């Protein structure tokens, strides 16, 4: 009915899609060999939003896997759920961009983009009524942050009316993973604004803080972070697949959550977070759920919200649950700290209720939130851009593929203006 | 079939865009194939059917042989790519005299024989894509003394490229027709 | 009327929250595990042959 | 019996024996939880 097209570019997007399709295959009960093996009937009625039908009852994940080097899809094929992915959905080159925006956006990522566009347009018209697209990538890289943003600029011109939300990866506050992310991330976010209507900003330090403080896991890998991301990615598209008493698709979470087209920057969370040693001492109730999302340490963007102010707040729930109590709890969290919400909108909270919880859980929630404190992600990236452009530090690696100098000035002026326009609502 | 349907200004049966286009259609193929292709003329999916014998392979519009679909709409329009090949398609209509009568349009014909079960007529086509227009009421008015009440079955044979087989209430010009029907 | 044999293979959870990953860290290391790169099954995008 | 020991661990875990002890206790509890939840799903084995 409302099918979802999933996009992944770069190795970060590839690992995220490797884990995201490990949860959707679990909840829809999909075998590693591609066969339904569950024990219910609610999981098969709306399976078309993620799985096409293949001859033999096989369910293949409808997705596009995009890269430029063979160094990371060997991992996604060698993964436990790597046999359900179709061979033709893999598009990749041999020598990658290597933390470069100019290459993967103009020279390398522009010659191979005709294959990815062909694969997308061949697959996307196989949906009965396409709802939209969803992309997971990293701004700090060169494969995703160039090529997936080229796809973002091209598919939007192809279908000028479909929903395009993205699960992007913004940088860490202190630790770096690449010396040049004040170039690729800003050059990707300059192009992100004019094509996307919703952007989930995820960063790795906030997930480390979640997996340490709120979880008591001592040795977490990147897969333990990919699972926490995939929890939110499954939570957002919940009501498409399962019925309930108050549904919300991605257009519902788009209309309700942005007052203006330039204010489409968001930051997510996830509700049930109890350690193994804190299982038996805590009860899965709706107040103990709703306490956690309005706390800073349970947030997937490293930005403290009491510096900022919530503009629009969304929340979807799961499970057969009471309703008077959840509305009472949102009213209580809205009326206690009145200084944390703007006063020109009285009702900032969106509520959608499903009835199928995640497996092994009974009550859960997924919070999508636009605020003012997300500016702190971009102010410092602008100050890093000014600290790097004033010395022309790595500029020779970018002008060597056919770039220009005034383009960087235009990008910095547009991002400074996007910076300035958010600040007026404090 | 299609008895409790509104039968609006346009009613569409086949479409190359979607999950299962040949859900209600029968797949008879002998020394041929059925496949779907991204076209290089309209940049979209088009059903593809061709085989070395033109009468062996086809698609029929109700899958069950005894079940028939009911369309009260008078006009039949189908978008086919002319591959300069042998292409035939045939309808079955009902009358007020309750007789099921058939019309056959053959690419390899130049003559017109009219007979109380099937009236064969020739067919010419342009270079590439086309909007072939069929008024079923006219065809049952000139060849036959009666008129048209219900279309029963439509058949599409090989050596052709189907997109968007549909019925319409009246001749729609290019302006009033929505962009998804071109 | 439904078999669904044993797997002995943990398949991701959130309330206990163990994540299915090959062991690369403390305690469970097992230094003689195979962390090597394997053979694929899809050729790369040789666009020179795809249109010729 | 295994979970009885897990609640008697240190409240501030820093050293390497404490870390590895927590890992083996978690592995034991999780093996037992998987075995229990697999058998509890039905009645015929």
């Amino acid at each position: 009915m409302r099918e979802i097209v999933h996009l992944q570019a770069g190795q970060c997007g590839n690992q995220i899609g490797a884990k995201f399709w490990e949860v959707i295959s679990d909840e829809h009960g999909i075998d590693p060999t591609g066969t339904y093996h569950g024990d219910s009937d609610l999981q098969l009625e709306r399976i078309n939003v993620y799985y096409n039908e293949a001859t033999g009852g096989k369910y293949v994940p409808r997705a596009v896997l995009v890269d430029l080097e063979p160094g990371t899809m060997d991992s996604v094929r060698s993964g436990p759920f790597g046999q359900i992915f179709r061979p033709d959905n893999f598009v990749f080159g041999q020598s990658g961009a290597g933390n470069n925006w100019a290459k993967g956006h103009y020279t390398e990522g522009a010659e191979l983009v005709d294959s990815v566009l062909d694969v997308v347009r061949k697959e996307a018209e196989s949906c009965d009524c396409l709802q939209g697209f969803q992309l997971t990538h990293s701004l700090g890289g060169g494969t995703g942050s160039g090529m997936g943003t080229l796809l973002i600029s091209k598919i939007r011109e192809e279908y000028p009316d479909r929903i395009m939300n993205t699960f992007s990866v913004v940088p860490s506050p202190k630790v770096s993973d690449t010396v040049v992310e004040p170039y690729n991330a800003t050059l990707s976010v300059h192009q992100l604004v004019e094509n996307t209507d919703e952007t989930y900003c995820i960063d790795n330090e906030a997930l480390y803080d979640i997996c340490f403080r709120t979880l008591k896991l001592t040795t977490p890998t990147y897969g333990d972070l990919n699972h926490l991301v995939s929890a939110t990615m499954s939570g957002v598209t919940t009501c498409l697949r399962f019925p309930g008493q108050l549904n919300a698709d991605l257009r519902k979470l788009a209309v309700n959550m942005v007052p203006f087209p330039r204010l489409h920057f968001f930051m997510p969370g996830f509700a049930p977070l109890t350690s193994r040693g804190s299982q038996q001492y805590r009860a899965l109730t709706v107040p103990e759920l709703t306490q956690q999302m309005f706390d800073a340490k349970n947030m997937m963007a490293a930005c403290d919200p009491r510096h900022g102010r919530y503009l629009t707040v969304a929340a979807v729930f799961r499970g057969r649950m009471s309703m008077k109590e959840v509305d009472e709890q949102m009213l209580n969290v809205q009326n206690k700290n009145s200084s944390y919400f703007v006063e020109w909108i009285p009702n900032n909270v969106k509520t959608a209720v499903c009835d199928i919880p995640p497996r092994g859980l009974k009550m859960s929630a997924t919070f999508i939130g636009n605020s003012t404190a997300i500016q702190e992600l971009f102010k410092r990236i602008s100050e890093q851009f000014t600290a790097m452009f004033r010395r022309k530090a790595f500029l020779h690696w970018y002008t060597g593929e056919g770039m220009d100098e005034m383009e960087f000035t235009e990008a910095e002026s547009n991002m400074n203006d996007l910076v300035s326009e958010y600040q007026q609502y404090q | 079939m299609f008895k409790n349907t509104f039968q609006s200004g346009f009613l569409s049966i086949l479409y190359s865009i979607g999950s299962k286009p040949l859900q209600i259609w029968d797949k008879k193929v002998r020394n041929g194939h059925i496949k779907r292709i991204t076209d290089n003329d309209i940049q979209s999916l088009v059903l593809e059917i061709e085989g070395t014998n033109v009468s062996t392979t086809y698609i029929t519009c109700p899958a069950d042989p005894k079940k028939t679909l009911g369309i009260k709409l008078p006009f039949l329009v189908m978008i086919i790519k002319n591959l300069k090949k042998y292409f035939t398609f045939e309808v079955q209509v009902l009358d007020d005299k309750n007789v099921r009568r058939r019309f056959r349009a053959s690419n390899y014909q130049s003559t017109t024989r009219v007979k109380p079960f099937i009236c064969t007529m020739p067919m010419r086509l342009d270079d590439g894509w086309n909007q072939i227009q069929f008024n079923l009421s006219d065809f049952t008015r000139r060849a036959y003394g009666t008129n048209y009440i219900e279309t029963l079955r439509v058949q599409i044979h090989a050596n052709c490229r189907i997109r968007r087989v549909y019925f319409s209430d009246r001749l729609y010009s290019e302006d009033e027709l929505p962009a998804e029907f071109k | 009327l439904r078999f669904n044999f044993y797997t002995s293979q943990y398949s991701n959870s959130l309330n206990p929250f163990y994540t299915l990953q090959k062991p690369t860290c403390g305690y469970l290391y097992r230094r003689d595990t195979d962390h090597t790169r394997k053979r694929f099954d899809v050729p790369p995008a040789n666009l020179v042959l795809w249109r010729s | 019996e295994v979970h009885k020991e897990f609640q008697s661990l240190s409240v501030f875990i820093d050293s390497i024996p404490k870390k590895i002890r927590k890992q083996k206790l978690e592995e034991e509890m999780k093996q037992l939880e998987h075995d229990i939840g697999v058998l509890e799903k039905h009645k015929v084995i």
Binding site: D128 | - | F3 | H42
Partner: peptide, 26 residues
């Protein structure tokens, strides 16, 4: 079993959940 919902343009088949537990057996 499945029930056919024939509308204009789009044709959809929808399944009906059954009330049987029916068990499993490892």
């Amino acid at each position: 079993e499945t029930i056919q919902l024939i509308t204009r343009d789009m044709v959809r088949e929808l399944i009906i959940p059954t009330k049987d537990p029916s068990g499993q057996s490892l």
